Design a protein around this ligand. Sequence first.
Ligand code: HEM
Length: 464
Amino acid sequence: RILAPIPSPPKHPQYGHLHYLAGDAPVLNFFQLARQIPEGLFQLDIQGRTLIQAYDPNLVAELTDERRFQKRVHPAYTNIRNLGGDGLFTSDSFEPNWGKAHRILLPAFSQRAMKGYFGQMLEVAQALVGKWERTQGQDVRVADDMTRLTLDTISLSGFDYRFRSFDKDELHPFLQALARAMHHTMTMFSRPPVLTPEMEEADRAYWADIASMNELVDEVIRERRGHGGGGGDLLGLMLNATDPETGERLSDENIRYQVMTFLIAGHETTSGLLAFTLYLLLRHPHVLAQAYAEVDRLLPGDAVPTYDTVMRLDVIPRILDEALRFWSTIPNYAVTALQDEVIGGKYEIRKGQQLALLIPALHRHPAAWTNPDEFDIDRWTSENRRTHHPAAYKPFGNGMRACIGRQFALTEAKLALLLILQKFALSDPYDYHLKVKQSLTIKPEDFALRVRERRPHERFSVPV
Ligand code: HEM
């Protein structure tokens, strides 16, 4: 109009910008376009909508300003809200139950709260190690076993339910329902207006699944309020805690939604972090050797780790942070424009437009990361960490709407890597070619490794 236009790449009357949306992982197509447009952002004119991907660290520092751009439930989250409800992940900050749930749960997710969950985390991690011990020489299904690990951990810490997912290949009917529900939610975005016979019955089953999950969690709540409530659990906490400002408690409906919300937002994000980390250690095996050495200094023999142990880790935490930089598992979350705004002093953003953070480009943008495409766990160290661009690492969201579960997922995954590397030697039997699938989150699809028990003489410890 009087300033610069956002760059748009055109490709034939055949197709359009729509080809950039096909495939298992569109965010990766966006990443390929961001490497060839150094301006810092681009736009796709899809039919009926405009999508703006931003990745320059200074343009992102602008989009991070909650005074101008904020999370907005409408469009993007409206389907996932079918089962997220008004819980933390699928509500706007100005809805009463967001402020309430935030102010109540924030302390229960703090780093100080983690020690109290460590027992349950360790139970689930040892279950996983057991399954792999019992199947040495068999193909380990990495995505699936991490899904099990984290789904079980967040259920056990979230409402003290044990799905015992390492006892049997079949998942509990509740988790099968969760799985079907989530996938239907992701396909609901592509809605052909004519509804096929099978689509209408898909929807019937969809709300039936949502109902059967609501039913199990409603019953757990009923049965523990009957026993006096007050477990040392996220559900135990929500049954009793009062909001510091409103003085009231969460409703029963909101508590069921927060439990569903823990499951939605916490299982595939964390399991993907672990799937990817294992892939990266397999393709950067000198780092994996460093990890082995850390494990053999702190967990020699059949030592059983404590929360303290996890806290004294160094290699494994930085492996995890750098892994998040390569493959952040929620890669394309959008901020909405509160008012018409001008970014970089250059581009024209109309009120209510979605700016998707292209996390892959941002985390690998060479302006902020010398040698962007190379794995260095030493980038994260106290001193080198302070040298990073302050808006270019955003694996856990932004501001008021940043992931509450960060410390939960990071302690869970430190523990997982610790116990796995303690007991197992990893092998890649098939030349795994990374294959990314995107839903709410991105994750490796057909990853298979093999494990042997580590022989005593293969530990880098100091003898008894
Ligand atoms: C590595 C694992 C995880 C990563 C990378 C991650 C990342 C993120 C990101 C990027 C967001 C922002 C979403 C948006 O603004 O649209 C978010 C939100 C959220 N995540 Fe996580 N998350 C992880 C694990 C977890 C876990 C384990 C929990 C709890 C069990 C959790 C609970 C939440 C919640 C409640 C929100 C909404 C925050 C609010 O509105 O107050 N996340 N997460």
